[PDB]
Amino acid sequence: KVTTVVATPGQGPDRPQEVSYTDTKVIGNGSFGVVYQAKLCDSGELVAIKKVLQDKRFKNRELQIMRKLDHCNIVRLRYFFYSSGEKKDEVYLNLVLDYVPETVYRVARHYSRAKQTLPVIYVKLYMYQLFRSLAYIHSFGICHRDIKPQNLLLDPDTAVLKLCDFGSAKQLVRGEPNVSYICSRYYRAPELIFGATDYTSSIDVWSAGCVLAELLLGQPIFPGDSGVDQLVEIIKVLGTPTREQIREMNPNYTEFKFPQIKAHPWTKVFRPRTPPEAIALCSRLLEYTPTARLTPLEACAHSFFDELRDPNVKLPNGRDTPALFNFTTQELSSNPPLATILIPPHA
Numbered sequence: 506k507v508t509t510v511v512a513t514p515g516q517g518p519d520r521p522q523e524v525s526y527t528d529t530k531v532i533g534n535g536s537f538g539v540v541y542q543a544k545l546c547d548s549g550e551l552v553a554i555k556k557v558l559q560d561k562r563f564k565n566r567e568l569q570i571m572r573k574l575d576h577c578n579i580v581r582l583r584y585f586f587y588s589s590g591e592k593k594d595e596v597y598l599n600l601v602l603d604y605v606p607e608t609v610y611r612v613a614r615h616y617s618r619a620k621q622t623l624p625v626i627y628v629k630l631y632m633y634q635l636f637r638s639l640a641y642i643h644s645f646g647i648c649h650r651d652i653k654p655q656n657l658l659l660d661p662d663t664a665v666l667k668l669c670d671f672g673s674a675k676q677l678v679r680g681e682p683n684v685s686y687i688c689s690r691y692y693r694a695p696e697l698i699f700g701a702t703d704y705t706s707s708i709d710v711w712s713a714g715c716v717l718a719e720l721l722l723g724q725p726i727f728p729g730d731s732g733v734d735q736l737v738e739i740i741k742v743l744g745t746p747t748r749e750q751i752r753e754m755n756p757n758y759t760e761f762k763f764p765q766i767k768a769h770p771w772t773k774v775f776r777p778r779t780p781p782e783a784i785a786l787c788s789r790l791l792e793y794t795p796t797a798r799l800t801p802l803e804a805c806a807h808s809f810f811d812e813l814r815d816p817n818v819k820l821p822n823g824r825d826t827p828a829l830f831n832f833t834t835q836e837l838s839s840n841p842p843l844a845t846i847l848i849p850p851h852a
């Protein structure tokens with residue numbers, strides 16, 4: 506079964522072309538719509554097709570964001586096209602993206618089910634690539650707003666990580682309010698739990714810190730089906746937020762009473778074989794004050810990633826590590842001096 510469409514390339518100028526594909530199978534479903542896998546007839550390359558319902562009143566925000574992104578750790582929009590679908594008289598937007606076979610969720614689940622942890626070399630590779638993708642999107646004012654393991658795509662043979670699902674992504678403008686109900690259970694920053702509408706891109710850094718801790722532990726660090734349960738788990742690790750810290754993440758919640766828990770030592774939260782650099786990185790990402798958390802680029806420069814910068818490092822499968830040092834001026838713009846650390850002498 507061959508489907509031919511007239512699709513517009515994602516990057517470059519608006520000059521459509523005939524794209525033919527086959528072997529269409531469903532690989533994802535949800536409130537967003539459906540993600541398919543397909544093979545392009547010309548090259549034989551696998552692609553993913555995200556199909557979503559198109560709002561008649563305005564251009565799809567995810568498409569506007571995707572057309573402006575170009576980074577090795579962000580899934581690439583190859584083409585886009587409009588089509589019919591399940592609901593009659595409704596137009597659908599189809600995003601043809603580069604296909605990535607695995608997710609951090611599935612991979613971590615294998616390890617947790619086998620009563621093991623993912624080797625720290627992979628924790629470093631994946632976490633570093635996530636912080637690069639965040640550094641890049643944050644350099645445009647764009648916040649992902651839904652960082653979680655299912656959104657971190659992985660190619661197991663090359664150890665490449667690609668951030669995906671820009672359905673909640675938004676360019677945050679200071680003074681313009683944002684909906685607080687974005688971000689998934691376990692990964693929500695405490696300002697989002699308190700329903701703040703004036704949050705910054707630093708909510709992605711809290712989410713990434715939750716992913717790091719979960720990869721170190723083998724289970725979520727702040728679980729719970731309600732915000733109050735999530736908050737008790739946060740207070741158990743971080744200690745009680747001060748009135749000042751509470752004011753920094755939604756000031757309308759300053760008069761509420763919180764359980765009095767003393768600041769637990771981060772060394773006791775993880776298994777004894779956990780690298781102290783990973784623990785130090787966690788404590789700097791999972792902070793109450795949104796401005797106290799490391800930026801993505803500062804996290805890339807952390808000592809936990811020094812092994813990645815060694816010229817002799819190789820993947821466990823014997824292959825070379827993927828591209829890690831091809832930083833652009835755009836990507837370094839939050840702190841250009843960091844290139845001194847980020848690009849090692851051998852690169």
Ligand SMILES: N#Cc1ccc(Nc2nccc(C(=O)Nc3cnccc3-c3ccccc3)n2)cc1
Nearest residue numbers: 532533540553580602603604605606607655669670
């Ligand atoms: N199981 C599975 C599985 C594993 C790998 C892929 N590969 C892949 N490759 C390129 C792009 C995308 C993509 O844009 N996905 C999404 C986009 N928007 C929302 C949600 C998703 C999504 C849904 C389910 C799982 C993970 C992401 N996914 C797909 C499914």
